[PDB]
């Protein structure tokens, strides 16, 4: 059909399937996952082992792939589990498990190398001369949509200066209570940028959460060099759109649009159905307007790292011991 296989819908996994494909086509991450020393792990208790199983099935199987073992592995079985969490939190669970299992191994540091960026959070008072420059690391960025036309305005809002004035002034300690400014500036941007849009806000005296189906534009190519304190020639902050995680409905149907090779040949992944689609269906048709189908997550890849992030993955990159273990489990399932 398309050389790509889908994932079976077996429950209220919601965004999970959409996330998995996005993680599966992060080829460097997939090859890193394949090499994790999971030989001694418990099959039904190891999240990395479940992820290796899922990636192997997505790469080799011709039939839709199931995720019961994975969902049992990270223990999201309560009724509201997927509804109570967001995609960032599930991605953090999976990647934290993977990174921790990679600690003390030959594939250590892959997660920070692919998804970690550096940020500066600053607080400076206008009256007294004091400055706090707490430095923070990030693996995902949650951009606001309400009132923002496109990604550029959302980023401007993210680095916007916030005024801490009377009745909300900043305690400068030795300098006493002072009026100040709080803000955030970007130091670095990861090779793989996980942007999540904020399409649900609390509404008092109402149904407590209304879906924000407002129009919001995102470009195929995202220049973010202007949002860095110090730029760098020969490595500009130009990013290529890679994944578009889309939701239809209200407070739903979750579908992921992906061009795995970064060539602009877009595909639609609707659980077990993977088809070819236009760029317009993947980008223009998911801005939102007045329908209910709009994008909630964007995944960008830096232009200078595309080839390394999207390394071609052959069936030989999977360690033969892992292949034997997975084949053994498949044999038992067949019997």
């Amino acid at each position: 059909h398309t050389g790509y296989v889908g994932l079976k819908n077996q429950g209220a996994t919601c965004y999970m399937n959409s996330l998995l494909q996005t993680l599966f086509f992060t080829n460097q991450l997939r090859k890193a996952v394949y090499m994790m020393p999971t030989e001694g792990d418990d099959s039904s208790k190891s999240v990395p082992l479940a992820l290796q199983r899922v990636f192997y099935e997505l790469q080799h199987s011709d039939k839709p792939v199931g995720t019961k073992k994975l969902t049992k592995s990270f223990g999201w079985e309560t009724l509201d589990s997927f509804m109570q969490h967001d995609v960032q939190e599930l991605c953090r669970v999976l990647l934290d498990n993977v990174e921790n299992k990679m600690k003390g191994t030959c594939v250590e540091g892959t997660i920070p190398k692919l998804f970690r960026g550096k940020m500066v959070s600053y607080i400076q008072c206008k009256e007294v001369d004091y400055r706090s420059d707490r430095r923070e690391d990030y693996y995902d960025i949650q951009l606001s949509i309400k009132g923002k036309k496109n990604i550029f305005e959302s980023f401007v809002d993210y680095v916007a200066v916030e005024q801490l004035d009377g009745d909300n002034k900043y305690d400068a300690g030795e300098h006493g209570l002072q009026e100040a400014e709080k803000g955030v500036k970007f130091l670095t941007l990861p090779p793989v940028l996980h942007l999540q849009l904020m399409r649900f806000m609390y509404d008092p005296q109402t149904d407590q959460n209304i879906k924000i189906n407002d129009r919001f534009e995102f470009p195929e190519q995202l220049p973010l060099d202007e949002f860095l304190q110090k730029t760098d020639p020969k490595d500009p902050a130009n990013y290529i759109l890679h994944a578009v995680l889309v939701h239809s409905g209200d407070n739903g149907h979750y579908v992921v649009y992906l061009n795995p090779k970064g060539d602009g040949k877009w595909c639609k992944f609707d659980d077990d159905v993977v088809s070819r689609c236009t760029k317009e269906e993947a980008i223009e048709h998911n801005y939102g307007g007045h329908h209910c189908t709009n994008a909630y997550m964007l995944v960008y890849i830096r232009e200078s790292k595309l080839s390394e992030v999207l390394q071609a993955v052959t069936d030989h990159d999977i360690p033969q011991q892992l292949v034997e273990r997975l084949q053994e489990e498949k044999r038992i399932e067949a019997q």
Partner: peptide
């Protein structure tokens, strides 16, 4: 504000 659907978180 929230990115996905579900119960309120605020």
């Amino acid at each position: 504000f929230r990115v996905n659907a579900g119960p309120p978180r605020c």
